Amino acid sequence: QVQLQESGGGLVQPGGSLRLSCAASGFTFSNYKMNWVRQAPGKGLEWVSDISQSGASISYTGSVKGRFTISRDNAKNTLYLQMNSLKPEDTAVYYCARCPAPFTRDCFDVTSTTYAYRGQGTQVTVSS
Template sequence: GLELSQPSVMVVKPGESPSFTCKVSGYSVSDSSISFATGWVRKPARKAMEWISNIWDDDASSNSVSLQGQSLQPEDTAVYYCVRNPPQ
């Protein structure tokens, strides 16, 4: 089956630029098919789920994707999820 694993908790201070990594199993992150694309969403408290526009990179050797946060601020507080895009 498919599995996407990421750290359960990460605490970031304002102004920091952390990297979030998601390990994928069950498909290849380097697969060019859109149905296997992996991306990121976040869920702020009391708000709707949001797609993340930050740049993310895939690493075929570890079959993982990383999201680079850039100078995060208190308003960026949210639960972040890596997700597999649904088949088109």
């Protein structure tokens, strides 16, 4: 059973910081690329950041580059997201999405409406 459960999140001051955690189980964590996606109120799902299986290759969306830091602990089966200097536009539900297939360079459908290998998300609200 593939299960992703995101921890952390809540009310933050505009400009503060936070750390999101993703507890992964039900699969070989060190074989899959991991992603962070989010859904702002009324907005669709959008990709935030991904990290390769080894952890050496990292990508960010432009709206969070320089402020957000993604990381993973393959020994603890955990995906982390350090969110520094949060803005009011970062208020969304953040989902932990696993790449569909192992040992793959491509990563399809992680932002789809009904993607299976994704957590239920944790709420992050940035408003004073």
